[PDB]
Structures are given as structure tokens and as C-alpha cells.
Amino acid sequence: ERLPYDASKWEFPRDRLKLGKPLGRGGQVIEADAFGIDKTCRTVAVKMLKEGATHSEHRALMSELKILIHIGHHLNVVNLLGACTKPGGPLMVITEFCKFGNLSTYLRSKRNEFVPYKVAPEDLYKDFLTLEHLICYSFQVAKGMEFLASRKCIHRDLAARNILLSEKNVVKICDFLPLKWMAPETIFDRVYTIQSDVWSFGVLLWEIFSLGASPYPGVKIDEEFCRRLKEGTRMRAPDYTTPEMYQTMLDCWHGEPSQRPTFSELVEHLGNLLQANAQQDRHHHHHH
Ligand SMILES: O=C(Nc1cncnc1)c1c(Cl)ccc2c(Nc3cccc(C(F)(F)F)c3)noc12
């Protein structure tokens, strides 16, 4: 809100947008066509308020926009393309469009199209999810969080429902029961810090390697849940996890926030895990 707004760089004409079917509601996000928004026609996502909403919501939408302008560009964070702020129409924030939707559902739908890895004749696993994909998505989300962390940002709601999937397996962090993703201090003291987001990154990890599963299955989210979380109880390994990966899930869920890895340590670690899987996959593919 204190951050300045460079209209000469981000302002887009309202009549250069044809709004289409809605995506989500909470303001509301919509799919759309933007003409000339980049250097001829492109698909975009527009977040706009309603008719007569609370001046506050306007203020909120504006500050959300300035935050995005502040954060900057990174391949793994939803990209801001423009915004209509001047008088004449409603306030709109325009970002790139990700066709495949949130990561959880996308994964949830590939449960009948998964193989640990591929070998000849690999044409039987066309459009199949594999460990490499899963670790790759985890690597990218980590890089985007290391980025955001590097800018003093704090997501506060990092989950699979807030990860978008684009062309060529590129995931992006965006921001549209949350208790299931919160760390102990965040639930009991109401404290949000970069470390608590790592806690959540851990919950995200579990979601990915459980192909879109809901965390803490069958548990009610009542007082007992909160107590067990506080006493050291943790989720069991998901169905598509590897041993190293599950352990990383455990590290992120460390009770002592300072003892949780950092997003830089996580990037460093997943990068390696990805490179090893790759190597094994090369040997698997070579022999058979
Ligand atoms: O959901 C959005 N776009 C979108 C893209 N593709 C498919 N569906 C929706 C979106 C739109 Cl239309 C406008 C602003 C933001 C947005 N802003 C944001 C605010 C604070 C922090 C962050 C993040 F950097 F943490 F991601 C993003 N995240 O996601 C959006």
C-alpha cells in the first residue's frame, strides 16, 4: 500500500479485454482475451471486484497488485501482465493464464496415468506422470518460495490449491480447511514467518506425492488434532513418495521452527534428488 504505482508501465485499457467464463469466486477471477497486452491476442486471468463493494476491498485489491509489482518476475510465481486502475471502470489485476488449473486437481486426475519412470517402448507412457514430474514440480515451487523469501514475503497459505500448472510442466505459485496446512506456532500463537511457510511447503510435498490427496485423511479438525500436532504427531508417508522425499517432509514439519530447513537448503536438496532420479532413469532406460 506504501509501494508506488507506475501507471506508465502496467496500465491496460479496459476495452482491450473481452471477459470470458469465470474461474473462481471468493473478489472473483475470470478468464479473458487481452489485445495488445504484450508488444497480438492473448489469454489472461483477470481478478476484479464487484459492483459497490467496500472501499476497503478496493484498497486491498490495490495493495495486492502493488505487492506483485514489488515482488518482481520469477518463472515460478504467477506473472502480472497488467492492470486497469484509472477511473472509468472497475479495478482489475491481470496475470498470465495457466490452462491446467490448480495442481491438486491436475494430479488427482493423473492417478491412472502414472509410472515411476519410462523405458522403451516409451510410447505406452505418453502424457504420463512420473517421479521426475513430481520432484520437478516440487523443485520449482521451492525455487519460487526461495525467491519470495528473498523479498521478505510470506505466503501464509501455501498449498496445492494455490499452485497453477502451465504448458510444458511449469508450475507457478499464485494466491486465490486451512488448519491442515498451518504450523503449530501459527495455530497457537498466530505467528506467520518464513519458517511456517516451510512447514506448509512440507504439507504441499505430501499433497504432490499423494497425487492430489487431502491431508490428514479421516481426521476431524477439532481440538484433538491441534493437540497431536503440538505433541509431535505426523502424517504417514504418501503412496507415491520416495524415502528421501518423505524425510524432507518430516524435516519441514520440525516442531522447532529454526530447525526446519530453509527454502535455499530445499532447492539445493531437491535439485540433487531430481538429478539422481534422472541418472537412475537413464540407467533404467538404457538397460531395458
Ligand atoms: O489467480 C490468479 N490468476 C490465475 C492464473 N491462472 C489461472 N487461474 C488464475 C491471480 C490474478 Cl487474476 C490476479 C492476482 C493474483 C495473485 N496475486 C498475488 C498476491 C500476493 C502474493 C502472490 C504470490 F506471489 F505469493 F503468489 C500473488 N495470485 O494469483 C492471482
Ligand 1 pocket, residue 47 CB under 6 Å: yes
Beta-bridge partner residues of 28: 25, 48
Q: Give the atom of ligand 1 at the shortest distance from the alpha carbon of 94.
A: 12
Question: Ligand 1 atom 5: the closest Cα is on which residue?
Answer: 97
Active site members: 157
Annotated binding site for ATP: 23-29, 47
For the Cβ of 103 lying below 6 angstroms from any atom of ligand 1, the answer is: no
C-alpha–C-alpha distance, residues 176 and 195, integer Å:
21
Amino acid at 163: I
Which residues on adjacent β-strands are paired with residue 277? none
Q: Which residues have C-beta within 8 Å of that of residue 166, sequence separation ≥ 6?
A: 96, 98, 99, 100, 172
Decide whether any atom of ligand 1 lies within 6 Å of the 17 Cβ.
no
Pick from 19, 142, 127, 25: nearest CA to 76: 142
Q: Which residue among 95, 145, 153 has the greatest number of ligand 1 atoms within 8 angstroms of its CB, and so is best to mutate?
A: 95
How many whole angstroms from 54 Cα to the centroid of ligand 1?
21
| CA 97/CA 164 separation, integer angstroms | 9
Exposed e or buried b per residue across 255-278, where buried means at least 16 C-beta atoms within 10 angstroms of its C-beta: eebeebbebeebbebbeebbeebe
CA of 72 to the centre of ligand 1 (A): 13
Domains and CATH numbers, the chain: 1-97 (3.30.200.20), 98-276 (1.10.510.10)
Ligand 1: centre distance to CA 223 (Å): 32
Angle (deg, nearest 10), helices 194-208 and 243-252: 150
Phi-psi region of 47 (alpha: psi -120 to 50; beta: other; left: phi over 0): beta
Q: How many CB atoms lie within 10 A of CB 123?
A: 7
205 and 249 Cβ atoms separated by less than 8 Å = yes
**Nearest to residue 66, comparing CAs of 9, 138, 141, 128?**
9
**Ligand 1 touching residue 45 (CB < 6 A):** yes
No. of H helices and E strands in the chain? 9, 7
Closest atom of ligand 1 relative to the 153 alpha carbon: 25
Residue 175 Cα to ligand 1 midpoint, Å, equals 5
Could you tell me the resolution of this structure in angstroms?
A: 2.9
- 97 Cα nearest atom in ligand 1: 6
